[PDB]
């Protein structure tokens, strides 16, 4: 029974990092040459 609550806390830490990485979108870069 108590192994379910230990496994649930492990998955919540990993899922918070996965969702936070999917939020990040970097702005495009325009390079002008002459």
């Amino acid at each position: 029974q108590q192994e379910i609550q230990q496994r649930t806390s492990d998955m919540l830490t990993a899922a918070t990092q996965l969702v936070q990485d999917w939020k990040q979108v970097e702005t495009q870069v325009y390079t002008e040459g002459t």
Partner: protein, 159 residues
């Protein structure tokens, strides 16, 4: 092997406490609350444009301007022929209830009411006149004046 299915569904409910159905229902609650907040009691005033003649005799009554809280009313001054009459100066009583914007050379005043039911008066001096023109300003009526054209009895610098 069956623990992994149990731990995944309880993790999902802690990560997302609101269903996609419940997010949609919560958005309808929020915009209905803003609709009741912005609604005005009774009926809103009718936006109108008017035109009056101003008599400088010592028996007549000063003219009346209808205002509304947060709205802009523009007053333009004309002579008897209809040409514009530029403004020299003005004097406003109770500046906590009304706000006036004016470029220093034109003939148009723009007045916004700040309070709901407080009324006052105003004195306007024109360029060629010695007699000042006195008005009264009452807000909170069943009509709001977007623009008032005022005919003044004399003759201005343009004719």
């Amino acid at each position: 092997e069956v623990i992994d299915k149990k731990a995944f569904k309880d993790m999902t409910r802690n990560l997302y406490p609101l269903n996609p159905e419940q997010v949609v229902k919560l958005k309808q609650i929020y915009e209905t609350s803003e609709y009741a907040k912005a609604a005005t009691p009774g009926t809103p005033p009718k936006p109108t444009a008017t035109s009056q003649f101003v008599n400088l005799s010592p028996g007549s009554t000063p003219p009346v301007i209808r205002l509304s809280q947060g709205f802009v009313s523009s007053l333009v001054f004309l002579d008897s022929t209809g040409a514009p009459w530029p403004i020299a100066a003005y004097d406003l009583g109770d500046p906590s209830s009304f706000n006036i914007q004016w470029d220093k050379t034109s003939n148009t005043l723009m007045i916004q009411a700040t309070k709901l039911y407080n009324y006052g008066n105003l004195a306007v001096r024109l360029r060629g006149l010695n007699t000042p023109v006195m008005l009264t300003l009452i807000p909170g009526q069943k009509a709001v004046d977007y623009r008032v054209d005022l005919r003044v009895q004399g003759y201005g610098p343009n004719a």
